[PDB]
Amino acid sequence: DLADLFPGFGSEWINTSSGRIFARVGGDGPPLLLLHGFPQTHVMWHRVAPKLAERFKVIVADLPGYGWSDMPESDEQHTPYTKRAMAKQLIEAMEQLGHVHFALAGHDRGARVSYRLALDSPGRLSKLAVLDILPTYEYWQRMNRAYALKIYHWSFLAQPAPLPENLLGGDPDFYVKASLASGTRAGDLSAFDPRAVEHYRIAFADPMRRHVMCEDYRAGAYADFEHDKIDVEAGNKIPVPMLALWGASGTPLDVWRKWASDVQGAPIESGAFLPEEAPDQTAEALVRFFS
Amino acid sequence: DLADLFPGFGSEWINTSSGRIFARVGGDGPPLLLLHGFPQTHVMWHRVAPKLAERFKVIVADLPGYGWSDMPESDEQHTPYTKRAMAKQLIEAMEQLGHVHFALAGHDRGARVSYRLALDSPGRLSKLAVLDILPTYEYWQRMNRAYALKIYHWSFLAQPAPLPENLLGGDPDFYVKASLASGTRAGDLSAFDPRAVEHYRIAFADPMRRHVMCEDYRAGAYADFEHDKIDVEAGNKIPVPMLALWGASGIAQSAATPLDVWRKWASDVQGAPIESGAFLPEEAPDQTAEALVRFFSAA
Ligand SMILES: *[C@H](Cc1ccc(C(F)(F)F)cc1)C(=O)O
Ligand SMILES: *[C@H](Cc1ccc(C(F)(F)F)cc1)C(=O)O
Numbered sequence A: 001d002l003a004d005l006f007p008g009f010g011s012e013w014i015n016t017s018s019g020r021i022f023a024r025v026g027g028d029g030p031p032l033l034l035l036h037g038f039p040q041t042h043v044m045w046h047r048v049a050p051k052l053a054e055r056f057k058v059i060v061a062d063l064p065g066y067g068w069s070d071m072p073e074s075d076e077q078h079t080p081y082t083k084r085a086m087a088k089q090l091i092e093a094m095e096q097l098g099h100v101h102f103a104l105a106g107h108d109r110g111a112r113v114s115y116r117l118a119l120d121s122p123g124r125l126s127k128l129a130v131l132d133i134l135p136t137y138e139y140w141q142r143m144n145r146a147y148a149l150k151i152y153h154w155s156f157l158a159q160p161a162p163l164p165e166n167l168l169g170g171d172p173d174f175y176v177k178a179s180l181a182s183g184t185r186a187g188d189l190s191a192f193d194p195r196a197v198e199h200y201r202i203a204f205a206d207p208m209r210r211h212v213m214c215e216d217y218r219a220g221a222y223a224d225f226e227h228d229k230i231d232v233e234a235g236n237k238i239p240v241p242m243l244a245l246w247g248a249s250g251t252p253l254d255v256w257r258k259w260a261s262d263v264q265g266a267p268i269e270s271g272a273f274l275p276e277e278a279p280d281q282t283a284e285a286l287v288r289f290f291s
Numbered sequence B: 001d002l003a004d005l006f007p008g009f010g011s012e013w014i015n016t017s018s019g020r021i022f023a024r025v026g027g028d029g030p031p032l033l034l035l036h037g038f039p040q041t042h043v044m045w046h047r048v049a050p051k052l053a054e055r056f057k058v059i060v061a062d063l064p065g066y067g068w069s070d071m072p073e074s075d076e077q078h079t080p081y082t083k084r085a086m087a088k089q090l091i092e093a094m095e096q097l098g099h100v101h102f103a104l105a106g107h108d109r110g111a112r113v114s115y116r117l118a119l120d121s122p123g124r125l126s127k128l129a130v131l132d133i134l135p136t137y138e139y140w141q142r143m144n145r146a147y148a149l150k151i152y153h154w155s156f157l158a159q160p161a162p163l164p165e166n167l168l169g170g171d172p173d174f175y176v177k178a179s180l181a182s183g184t185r186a187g188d189l190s191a192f193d194p195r196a197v198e199h200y201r202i203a204f205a206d207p208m209r210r211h212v213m214c215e216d217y218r219a220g221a222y223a224d225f226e227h228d229k230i231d232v233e234a235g236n237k238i239p240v241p242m243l244a245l246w247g248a249s250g251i252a253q254s255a256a257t258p259l260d261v262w263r264k265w266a267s268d269v270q271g272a273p274i275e276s277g278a279f280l281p282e283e284a285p286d287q288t289a290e291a292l293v294r295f296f297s298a299a
Helices: A083-096 A109-120 A136-142 A145-150 A163-168 A172-183 A194-204 A207-221 A223-234 A252-257 A279-290 B083-096 B109-120 B136-141 B145-150 B153-157 B163-168 B172-183 B194-204 B207-221 B223-234 B258-265 B285-297
Strands: A010-014 A021-026 A031-035 A057-061 A102-107 A125-131 A242-247 A263-268 B010-014 B021-027 B031-035 B057-061 B102-107 B125-131 B242-247 B269-274
Touching (some): A031 A083, A083 A109, A102 A279, A109 A207, A136 A223, A145 B153, A163 B172, A172 B163, A194 A207, A242 A279, B021 B083, B031 B109, B102 B109, B102 B285, B109 B207, B125 B285, B163 B207, B172 B194, B194 B207, B242 B258, B242 B285
Parallel strands (some): A031 A102, A102 A125, A125 A242, B031 B102, B102 B125
Antiparallel strands (some): A010 A021, B010 B021, B021 B057
């Protein structure tokens, strides 16, 4: 049995035109959507969501194709796993709950969905927080030897199918665990709750889920990059008030200032898994910003 | 069984301070060392070595850690699999045969051993040919989005052990065959002799051999890059007459005019493309052999 790490929260399967979105839902007050990244699921918010739920209705969603959300059929341009499409699908999900204007925080891939959502449909967001990321365009522009070695996933997982799928299927438990440990300050799994790690391992064990992650990275190399490049070339900035947080061992505020007209930010001592490695600091920063 | 693809050639298993070098040896005349790359072994010269042996004493060697050569234990700096160390080791092997001044042609990793040998110990070489490559420094300096997506293997295989080893171990035949096919002009295995593919597959089947390949790419990301960086920043050029040959659909040309790049690294360089992917001596054996015979035979 996978553990229930959100005591008090409901479990909802929310319909959209592209498939169901699974979410844990707790609290009352203004609506706040939380979006996880790779290689994780909604459970990564389990240490910060309760504190947010003291003041907000918190909706903790599995991204399209991740976790227990349905996996829409992809295509040659990876369309359903582009951040523009995932944002449209999560906008539909929020409309099923009657939420057309909400607060949003995302981490890693979910943060990519979130800033794309803010660029495409800023009217949907009261405030936005992004965790542990720079825009996809900035990672690719920075691409050099040092980055190619650090963020090798961006080129490896984007290789044409079935290359990464075939490699990942030999020992997916090792890969997911080694990858998680490698992004933390500690270099091991000690910053994660073992019950959460089990959620991540079980999702990663499904070849269909791993294919989705590769489609996500293929979109990140191609259409998501092109979408971002258009905004850079147009001089488009996010007008939604926003917060950028990042683990120092994972400036970023200088970068976000080029992408957003009202942005505040701060490093926190942590690797790339802020809500699990530094939950108190992360929750405090998010509560203060969204309140 | 593994086929003899150099019918009539002898063999040597040559001791050095870092372990044995296996080679096939044929012909007579001036000495010519041939060095293969990844994910191959000495057998990739089988369609050209017999032609070269009409004119030269040909030594077709497995790189340190590859094929039937011994695998020295590596270290945190990947030292024995750096091109500097491999070149020192192959200099020792050649001296065991009485060759202290010789001609050298390398392909892929073997071409990287070769130009590093030329930079560190130019007196060892009469002439040098590099096939299918740019210097390691130039590959890394050209890193951007397009290049990173095109040649992902450098950064993937250089990840800390045991991550690439663990990924490659689940289905190693799939990876080596897909990799080989991916480099050829047509994208399939048709360019290769199936007996040669079986040599490559059997080598790749051994986890210790795959570990060496990762160590070779870890050196390629770190010390090899640093060694090259020192030379290009110092303006050190190879003085040995050299030939650069590359497949037009191969790796070196991906985002470069290779001869222009080599002219930065070498004071006496000529070269040409050949219609081929990245496995010139198998995909275009007659043209490769002719180019090498003509270059090494000229004065
Ligand atoms: C997520 C970046 C990313 C990729 C891989 C890891 C880890 F540690 F698991 F290997 C962490 C973070 C993104 O692409 O947004
Ligand atoms: C060799 C470059 C290289 C890498 C991969 C392949 C292939 F086709 F097998 F995938 C060919 C050549 C080097 O690093 O020198």
